[model samples]
Target: GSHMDTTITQNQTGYDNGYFYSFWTDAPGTVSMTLHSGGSYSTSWRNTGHFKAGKGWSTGGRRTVTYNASFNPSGIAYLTLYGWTRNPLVSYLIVESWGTYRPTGTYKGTVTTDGGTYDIYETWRYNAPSIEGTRTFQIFWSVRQQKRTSGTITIGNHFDAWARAGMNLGSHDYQIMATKGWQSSGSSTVSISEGGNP
Candidate 1:
């Protein structure tokens, strides 16, 4: 038997295998997502505006992540822990792995945790699409110096690191482990879990 697969071209939001997922693409891009039981999924895309699949929550919190993934990129891609916050309005990424160009901005410093070091960066967007609609906001990043495909991520460590850098996250909105691509093509298979085996 084959696992369930979902393909999307426009914006979509729903639940899959007991987890929440949302997918969106602006135009001239195509995305395909395959969902498996127990927190496993596969995705493929080309020239996508943006694509992501993970938990959709009312609030974000501290959690441990365990994941194993096989990622292939013909262009640019990011395998990241992605989310947003309200009030102050911020978009954040705890990037685990990426393809091609590296993500960087106003460098804050570096954070060492989970047997690795991550470079911190912050950048502002005047008016951009956010969970709360178009607004001016900030973006925080923690890009791992050495990338890995399988490991444990202590999500709170990054948050605490950001706090220490004078960056404050507002009221929680939604947090998710996601993949984003831009003017690029890629494919990924990820099995993710929280606290234990998925």
Candidate 2:
């Protein structure tokens, strides 16, 4: 898939999106997705050790990330992903869009969403930002649990409360799907616990 270039208008929200034109596909009991870094010119980690998009900045070793997605039913099909990005790095530390890319926290708690309850990990980076006035990571590798679906319907606000004290981090970042989006949408959700999905 090639990179998508779309023009966006900034508002007080700063969280709107469009069609990405790629990464939407599935097979029998198999599904996946990948978001690349760089606009048209993607680079390798061996070259540049980090990736930045929105308020997302990671010490990325891989230039591209192909996420493993799942579906509700069996068989195969294909659909193009919506939304374009100037940057496409997914894995990172911070969650919300308040600070830039530097947050510090340890073993938050669980926050449930359309998918399932994730052992929500929370961190805080005071005043973090990408090169161009960014906020929050636009694209997140939200590989939900088997409790996830291609369309049970999911949307923004996937990142929710930290269980303790009831604080939410980031919104559910939803990718476009043919199936009806909702609470069980997308492929699968990741049950992150103490830094690993185990």
lDDT of 2 by residue, 60-154 (tens): 11121122223221211111122222343122221211111222345445444543543333333333443234445432222232332222222
TM-score top scorer = 1
| Candidate 1 per-residue lDDT over residues 133-168, each given as its tens digit | 779999999999988777877889899999999988
Which stretches in model 1 have alpha-carbon errors above 4 Å?
A: 1-3, 55-58, 196-198
Candidate 2 has what TM-score?
Answer: 0.29
TM-score of each: 0.90, 0.29
Q: In candidate 1, what residue range of length 10 has the lowest lDDT sum?
A: 50-59
Off by over 4 Å in 2: 1-44, 53-104, 113-116, 131-165, 168-198
Write down the lDDT of every candidate, Cα atoms only.
0.78, 0.25
Q: CA lDDT of 110 in candidate 2?
A: 45
**Please, what's the RMSD in Å of model 2?**
15.5
Query: Number of clashing residue pairs in every model?
Result: 0, 29
